[PDB]
Structure 1
Amino acid sequence: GGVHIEPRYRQFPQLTRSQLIQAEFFSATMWFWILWRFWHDSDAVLGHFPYPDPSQWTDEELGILPDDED
């Protein structure tokens, strides 16, 4: 199916340039996709809507009377 590559016996195996170029291309493609999506849609990771502080809400908007009315 492929090309002929002979055994090497205690040395680094013979490497075709095609496999190197494809592996590098796919790794770079994944990293580019991650960067592109982070740039375009970062609120899926960091969040978009603020989380409110329950203690910051005053008794006026929360319906609390000064402990004597009711």
Structure 2
Amino acid sequence: HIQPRYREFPQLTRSQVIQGEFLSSLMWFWILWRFWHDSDAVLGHFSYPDPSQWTDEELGIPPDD
């Protein structure tokens, strides 16, 4: 049970602050841990080919005529 406060910053219990920082910090540990172990958020890990560098031999573009 807590006490009503008038025009003052409600007093906070030890647990309220620790649990809150706990959940948030694990969120950040998880984001950092996965980013390091699995950074395929960017680039996936397969590079897009430049469709405009395929030698005409590659695609079967006959010699014009």
TM-score by length of 2: 0.91
Aligned length: 64
- Match among 18, 23, 44 for residue 21 of structure 1: 18
- Match among 6, 10, 33 for residue 9 of structure 1: 6
- Match among 14, 27, 30 for residue 30 of structure 1: 27
Structure 2 segments unaligned to the other structure (5+ residues): none
Per-residue CA deviation, residues 6-42 of structure 1 (Å, 9 max, x unaligned), is: 1111111111011101101111000000000111111
Specify the alignment match of 1:40 in structure 2: 37
Structure 1 segments unaligned to the other structure (5+ residues): none
TM-score by length of 1: 0.85
User: Taking every aligned residue pair, what percent have the same amino acid on both sides?
Assistant: 83
AA of the residue aligned to 2:8: Q
Report the structure number with the largest CA radius of gyration: 1
User: Any runs of at least 4 consecutive aligned residues in structure 1 with deviations exceeding 3 A, and if so which?
Assistant: none
AA of the residue aligned to 1:41: D
